[PDB]
Amino acid sequence: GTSNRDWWPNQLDLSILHRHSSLSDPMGKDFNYAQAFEKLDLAAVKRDLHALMTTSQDWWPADFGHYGGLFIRMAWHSAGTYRTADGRGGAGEGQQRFAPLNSWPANANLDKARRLLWPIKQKYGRAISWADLLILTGNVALESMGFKTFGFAGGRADTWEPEDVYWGSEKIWLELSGGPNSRYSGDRQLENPLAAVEMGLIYVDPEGPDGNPDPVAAARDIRDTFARMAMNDEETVALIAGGHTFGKTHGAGPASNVGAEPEAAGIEAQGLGWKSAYRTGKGADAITSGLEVTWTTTPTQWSHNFFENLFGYEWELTKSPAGAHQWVAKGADAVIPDAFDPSKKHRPTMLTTDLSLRFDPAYEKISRRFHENPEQFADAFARAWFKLTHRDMGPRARYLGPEVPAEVLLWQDPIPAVDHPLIDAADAAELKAKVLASGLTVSQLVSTAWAAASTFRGSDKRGGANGARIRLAPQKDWEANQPEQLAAVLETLEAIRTAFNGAQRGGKQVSLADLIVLAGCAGVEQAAKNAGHAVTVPFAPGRADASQEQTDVESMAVLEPVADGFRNYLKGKYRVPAEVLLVDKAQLLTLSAPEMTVLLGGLRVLGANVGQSRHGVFTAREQALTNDFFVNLLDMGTEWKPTAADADVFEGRDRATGELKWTGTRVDLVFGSHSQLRALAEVYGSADAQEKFVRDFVAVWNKVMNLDRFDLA
Amino acid sequence: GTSNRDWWPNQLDLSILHRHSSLSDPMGKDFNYAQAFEKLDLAAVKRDLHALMTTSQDWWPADFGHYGGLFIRMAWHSAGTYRTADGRGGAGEGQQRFAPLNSWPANANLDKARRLLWPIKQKYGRAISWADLLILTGNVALESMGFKTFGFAGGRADTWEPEDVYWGSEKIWLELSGGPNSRYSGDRQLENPLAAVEMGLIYVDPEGPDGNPDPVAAARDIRDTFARMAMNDEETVALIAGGHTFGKTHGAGPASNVGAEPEAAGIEAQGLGWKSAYRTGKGADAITSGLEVTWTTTPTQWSHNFFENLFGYEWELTKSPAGAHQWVAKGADAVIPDAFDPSKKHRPTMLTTDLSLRFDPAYEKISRRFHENPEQFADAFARAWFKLTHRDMGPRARYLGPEVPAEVLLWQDPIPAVDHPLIDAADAAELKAKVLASGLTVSQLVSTAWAAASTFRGSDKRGGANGARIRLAPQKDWEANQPEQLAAVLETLEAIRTAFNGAQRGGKQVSLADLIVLAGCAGVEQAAKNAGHAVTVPFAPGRADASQEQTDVESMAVLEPVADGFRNYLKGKYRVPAEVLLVDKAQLLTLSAPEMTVLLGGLRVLGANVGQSRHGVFTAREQALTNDFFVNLLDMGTEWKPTAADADVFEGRDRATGELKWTGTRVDLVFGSHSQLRALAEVYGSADAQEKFVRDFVAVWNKVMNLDRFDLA
Ligand code: HEM
Ligand code: HEM
Ligand SMILES: [Cl-]
Ligand SMILES: [Cl-]
Ligand code: NA
Ligand code: NA
């Protein structure tokens, strides 16, 4: 059946903005997962999970009689898809249970792991999400095997369809670099936003880069991909060596014995995949990655044996029974237990990427320190495990249940608690009048609030105006934020703030975070008045100001908007067309297509463009809140053509005279070209639509202003 | 970016069930288009459209100084995509303005026609939909040129994204038959549900079948496609000759001059396409189809000159300036006006498909009668034009405005007026108790009501339980409806009805249509009580009973369910797997994926299967409304394998013992296989889900019962 994507494979895709509708959700529209979770008997769930660890099922027998290593890998892979570049992936949506991740080659046999958990899921129902369950199971696996975890938070609501993520452009699973759709160019430079070396891997190839078994070059891939997952060297070594303290890999026979992944399997497979024709196809005969490595002498118990083995032997390159590259300890005795036959022991083995932790010089120093100081290792691994499995959960306000660690961690972008009365409505009116009396213009107030609030992304719930980080490094210096203009607004607002706060009684004070937002609201009000409309814009106080010391400058860098169509900004030339980057930003903002449309057309007329660019400013009454963008964009009296200087800038001329009326970019003109966007623009450009436009603009403006307000959840 | 559809191109696509979300709709959740339309000054809109007909724009100059022919073609094409097989296509959703239909080669230059109407659309805003405006414009065209239309109804609400329609499997526009994705097999048998001879055409190729200019063979393709659009020979001849009374074709130069269709065009083309390098690119130089024919001596005035020319000349095969096959009158004088140069005239010309109306012997008889009696022609054309443009609008209850024709037409599947008091809540309770006391079983009652209500399709708003047509030919004899069992139920209900209605005063009576639905409601309540749960199922009276004489038996044939997964029914073996046909049915029923899931699982345990098949009946308490379908389907204690006799029937055995527990079809087991469906089944299969399951089942049951209830809109 031929589709629109077949005929016009490059047209923009707006269905990414309309996922996750109430239509696909089986829960009623008022269901609140946090409320369900908070009444869960978490202790009961944990007891059942502890029981499960050693309850072997014959359709996928437990190695060593204990599923803990399998479950650790399952939770690690749940979390492991995370990319800092866009915040997409991670554990927080339970996406391992849907395509494509349920069928990635690196997730082979995790279908079995998930299926082992169905009885517990069934028993507790909506009070524990799959998303929470995968991580809690990993925690219980660790605790069961003698490792004390740093804590756990619930609150990951389940989702009900696949998330739209760019995972790469290869058309072949596990394609090595340099193909027609390579993710690598130059000196092994991985394309942003990707954080894995091959399509269908988590981070790196366990055999080495492009299959070449060099530990030193593998380390370079490890460092790069883990950094793209928000992890530094100490965290990386702790996580790899911690995880590989447990369990084993599976490669008992040739890979050609393994059949179709879950999404390809027949209907009778009932959602499982990778059925194997090798011997019994399971247990002792399992094939998952094709590697056959068991790291420690006690694979079901926390130990310090990983680093003892890593440093205590020299290593020889060998092949598994499936033909994959791996390492075996020279001259060792058979000291590692077999998973099924108590009469069999094996020599210590390692992956190429495990050897990276000894042969990369920076990792070697950490590894040695961990070998010499095992308590350091344990604490680092516990902290890293917590970070790995919570890094996409957002502010601490979203963390639920009795095991949330009290310690505030820098990567959580912490926001101080408020410990004073908040401004009320009379105070808000007094502050908005002060702001408008200061001389700050509508363009300045809207631009500033926009810059502050629009760093939010719903993928990992980072960013937003809470914290007033716009005033700190690095946000204060981002080009899109117009650092010189920004500084002047902030000084004026800080003086208003100081004067208001110094006049108060009791402890009442306004934060700068709240004042930035409220000043934006006053801008919008003023713009509506400029257009002859009375409009009140809603404002909710309660934001606090974070410090520079609470603000990791290197972690904040990934929030920098290099493309922000809402301010007609593009920091450089990119291969993806600007209108696709606009839709991508709208998705991170949680906007629908109508919301993106209304928002952009209003911002253009309020003066929110970077540098005061006239591109898309289709009005003769700038700083007035009108639907002029739409009415003028849709006027067939104007003809548009690209400029000779720049094919991405367009000139709009009177059709009859030739006279220049406007200029615009691709992000402006898409609204007149894309047949779905244009249908939305037509609603707002109609004669009956001015009041609708104003009211829909205020609603979407407020939405953006509140995106990070989980304190009001 | 590689997508799930790239990796698994045959997996089932559930996003067809989740279109039209409140996310994508720019109007607020409370917008009601009928309430807007009812206050539109339709007379004023028509005056504006009348003026537009002779107000030429220089970017697309009006042939003859009159846009009427262009607008008639536009309205005809808006309607002309309709297929009776599934009800999909037609003018009722305004889909011409979205992909793919906006860019079909047969719709070339209708982009210009729609753009001409933006000022009016803009002026009247949400009070007239695009969908209604396209049709209205064609009526105003006709009226402006001296033709009396049959009437007009508003009420077609606009849509905001493309509909999911199977238009064929070809990957090339206008592909000739016999390719690797041919839509023809056997002796020129067009595959169902398609109603056009090539991809991107409306009905037929104007040059002849596969480009062969034989009018006799063309006539076969005309008859077949028009019948697949619900039009008979009289109506077909009336429509083709009626439409070709007006305007002209456009083929002034070679087609290689014409550029990209709108969806492929550059951003600067602002939604238009087919830009032409031939001379001025427009007006006297226009190229649309590549044909260059002007049919009558007065292309801007209704006449009977089409038939005067068709029968008063002999015709010679010729070529247009673009090389297309067309016909010219032998020996004729230059009597046809030129569209722009008042000093130039031309000989009469015709398409191959126009000549079909004289050289097909059946058409020739109708065409001669129309030639001799042009008043017969005018009335047939007006009736056909109304039917064409309204055929997908649904029951007459949906028809809005002051020009609705009072004549009731058989093709409307008309429902008599109700002229008596309706039953109240106490009456409904009395009737449900009588029905249950009669001995009719839960399975009988549920199956009967399901059979009656589930003929609805949202594509053209035909079918449903209103009318009690289940008791008439042909519904009473459809295999899926189990004719002998259905007859026994209907006799019992008719006796209850007679007794209740004979006891009343005051003229209160209950229709059989209502009692069929009410009795199904009693069954569902009884099933709930069998499970230990008291629930009330909502019921809304006001359906009426249609007669046999008010029922077109041949038009009702396309509503027969040949595949109904909700009753585990497949009338024969099809190319398309049964789970794909289930999703197709659910889309016609307007169900989401959660709604489809709940409904199916509940119908399985109520005894709704055709023939009392055990397939999918995963319960030991049949006729009790429980979630047993889901709990048993999801039990990993059961292993599934296809049977040797039939690869589409599966046995479920105990994994440990081999003992046979169940049988199922593809439609049952897809809920345990597809990863999104399985996620939904898991919710309803959980230990906390009995209350939810019952509530959600009752709600979707009531939804299905009420699909055709536009009297309650
Ligand atoms: C450079 C990074 C890493 C690579 C290349 C890697 C590679 C793999 C491979 C190839 C397997 C075998 C799959 C199979 O055949 O069953 C595996 C197993 C496993 N990995 Fe990793 N791993 C990495 C990091 C991690 C991390 C960070 C953790 C957790 C903290 C982890 C925990 C596990 C465990 C527990 C197993 C054993 C599974 C079982 O017992 O069934 N690994 N690793
Ligand atoms: C066998 C069925 C039919 C065929 C093959 C056919 C074919 C065409 C073609 C090839 C064009 C020329 C497009 C262009 O070059 O501008 C056209 C024009 C047109 N057709 Fe048809 N047609 C059919 C039925 C109808 C029907 C049912 C009507 C309306 C009742 C209709 C009304 C028109 C009008 C009014 C024009 C002139 C457009 C103008 O003036 O711009 N046609 N036809
Ligand atoms: Cl994601
Ligand atoms: Cl459609
Ligand atoms: Na994420
Ligand atoms: Na339709």
From Swiss-Prot, chains A, B:
Mod. after translation: Formation of the three residue Trp-Tyr-Met cross-link is important for the catalase, but not the peroxidase activity of the enzyme.
Co-factor remark: Binds 1 heme b (iron(II)-protoporphyrin IX) group per dimer.
Binding site for heme b: 244
Keyword Heme: yes
Biological process per Gene Ontology, one example term: hydrogen peroxide catabolic process
Keywords: Heme, Hydrogen peroxide, Iron, Metal-binding, Oxidoreductase, Peroxidase
Tryptophyl-tyrosyl-methioninium (Trp-Tyr) (with M-244) cross-link site: 76-203
Placement of covalent cross-link Tryptophyl-tyrosyl-methioninium (Tyr-Met) (with W-91): 203-229
The keyword Metal-binding belongs to this UniProt entry's keyword annotation: yes
Active site: 77
EC number in record: 1.11.1.21
GO molecular function, one term: metal ion binding
Reactions catalysed according to its record: H2O2 + AH2 = A + 2 H2O; 2 H2O2 = O2 + 2 H2O
Cofactor: heme b
Leading EC class: oxidoreductase
CDD domains, sorted: catalase_peroxidase_1, catalase_peroxidase_2
Gene3D superfamilies: 1.10.520.10, Peroxidase, domain 2
Any one GO cellular component localisation term in the record: cytosol
Site feature (Transition state stabilizer) residues: 73
Entry-linked PANTHER family: CATALASE-PEROXIDASE, HYDROPEROXIDASE I, BIFUNCTIONAL CATALASE-PEROXIDASE
Function of the protein: Bifunctional enzyme with both catalase and broad-spectrum peroxidase activity.
Family the entry assigns: Belongs to the peroxidase family. Peroxidase/catalase subfamily.
Protein name: Catalase-peroxidase
